[PDB]
Design a protein around this ligand. Structure first.
Ligand code: HEM
Length: 456
């Protein structure tokens, strides 16, 4: 019984594109979803996709025998500097499976034991920065979380120190990377890209790509020359061999993986830490519960890997922040073969689907009617959550390879913040979600009063 699907307002030849001509497209899509339901068609010039919001349909979309990851236009633009790294490659590209096989072990929960010391190094820098603020000062949350995540990924990724806490202006690589990502995201909403008015953007874009490649290529070359072995991903990549073929990743691909870790993990993880602190200061009883656990568990001057694993409630707080505002809000899929979705929507080979994660996470048939409330206790027993109901890290073999790294980092840092400071929402901050490739609470600021507990 084929059902025709909904579609928002069209604009002649422009189709639906004008509707995303806003600074907050995902939040706009969420409203369209509220209006049209679990599935709606969305067209742009020369493009068509279908946005899914219900767990019932998304669970079918997550069947890998039927759908595979699609490279959205955003990922195609990011590929200009992320290359055939894991995030911007097709599943069928030789280098995707090769890098996946080599890197998977280096990203397991067990492997986090090896990155822990480096994560603690940067976390201690963040805590010390806040301990050193004077009384009249405050904290710019996303800004400091981003300094932390970029530096942590640089240190664990290739033993390089961006030293973000020593600067007002970021290290040149960071400025170039951030500018390159911004340019890639800006191309999504510029009709006449060839307009000479964009010749300066193109020149700057090529310059930024060169800054990124030059630094990373240099570090790879310096490492191969010295023969030094470290606890970073670069050592794993220089020494790894794909079990299927016996081939190692070549230097160019290693460079793209390094750039990819920074691109894929810096903003998503800092956004998660920022949203989590936002929900905590807005819900004092929850912050109190989380602070009590941190004080009980983190009994040493420096957290150990095992202690971070015991911060169960902090982990629930992070999952609930990811439920409400998953920081990489949507992912794209294509139909591998002709198929019918949900018994009513026929699809043809190659047809695209978009999983709208914030909406999936607000499916009342799964979570209950109080979906807008921040309640970490929803994650008390993970086994009760239906398959494919909670997907902040994507799906299947193309799910986030950095999930254990991101959660270890976030749990460690949030635990240390809760152990060391009391927090004040001194401006009664009004949530304003800024959208780029990711989501974050723009302008979120707080004041942190030290509990004066030694940090080893
Ligand atoms: C809470 C923070 C994070 C979130 C929410 C997140 C989310 C995601 C999502 C949704 C995908 C799937 C994208 C798609 O289907 O197109 C993904 C892929 C990926 N993420 Fe993350 N991520 C986070 C942190 C990280 C970190 C810290 C790293 C690096 C240490 C990382 C590395 C990657 C890579 C390499 C892929 C592509 C994997 C593959 O396709 O083989 N992510 N991530």
């Amino acid at each position: 019984t084929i059902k025709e699907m909904p579609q928002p307002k069209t604009f002649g030849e422009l189709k639906n594109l004008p509707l995303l001509n806003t600074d907050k497209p995902v939040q706009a899509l969420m409203k369209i979803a509220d209006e049209l339901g679990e599935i709606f068609k969305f067209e742009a010039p020369g493009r068509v996709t279908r946005y899914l919001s219900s767990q019932r349909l998304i669970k079918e979309a997550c069947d890998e025998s039927r759908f595979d990851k699609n490279l959205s236009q955003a990922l195609k633009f990011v590929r200009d500097f992320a290359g055939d790294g894991l995030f911007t490659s097709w599943t069928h590209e030789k280098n995707w499976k090769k890098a996946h096989n080599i890197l998977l072990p280096s990203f397991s929960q067990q492997a986090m034991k090896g990155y822990h010391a480096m994560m603690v190094d940067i976390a201690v820098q963040l805590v010390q920065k806040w301990e050193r603020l004077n009384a009249d000062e405050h904290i710019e949350v996303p800004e400091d979380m981003t300094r932390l995540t970029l530096d942590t990924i640089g240190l664990c990724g290739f033993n390089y120190r961006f030293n973000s806490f020593y600067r007002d202006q970021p290290h040149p690589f960071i400025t170039s990377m951030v500018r390159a990502l911004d340019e890639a995201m800006n191309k999504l909403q510029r009709a006449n890209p060839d307009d000479p008015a964009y010749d300066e953007n193109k020149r700057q874009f090529q310059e930024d790509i060169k800054v990124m490649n030059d630094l990373v290529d240099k570090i790879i070359a310096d490492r191969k020359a010295s023969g030094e072995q470290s606890d970073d991903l670069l050592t794993h990549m220089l020494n790894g061999k794909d079990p299927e073929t016996g081939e190692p990743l070549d230097d160019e691909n290693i460079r793209y993986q390094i750039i990819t870790f920074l691109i894929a993990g810096h903003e998503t993880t800092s956004g998660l830490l920022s949203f989590a602190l936002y929900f905590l200061v807005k819900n004092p009883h929850v912050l109190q519960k989380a602070a009590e656990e941190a004080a009980r568990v983190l009994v040493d001057p420096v957290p150990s890997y095992k202690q971070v694993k015991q911060l169960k409630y902090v982990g629930m707080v992070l999952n609930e922040a990811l439920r409400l505002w998953p920081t990489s809000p949507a992912f794209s899929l294509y139909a591998k073969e002709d198929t019918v979705l949900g018994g009513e929507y026929p699809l043809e080979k190659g047809d695209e689907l978009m999983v709208l994660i914030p909406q999936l996470h607000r499916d009342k048939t799964i979570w209950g009617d109080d979906v807008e409330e921040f309640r970490p206790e929803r994650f008390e027993n993970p086994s009760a959550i239906p398959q494919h109901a909670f997907k902040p890290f994507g799906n299947g073999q193309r799910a986030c390879i950095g999930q254990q790294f991101a959660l270890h980092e976030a749990t460690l840092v949030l635990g240390m913040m809760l152990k060391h400071f009391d927090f004040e929402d001194h401006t009664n901050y009004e949530l304003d979600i800024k959208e780029t490739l990711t989501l974050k609470p723009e302008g979120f600021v707080v004041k942190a009063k030290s509990k004066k507990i030694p940090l080893g």
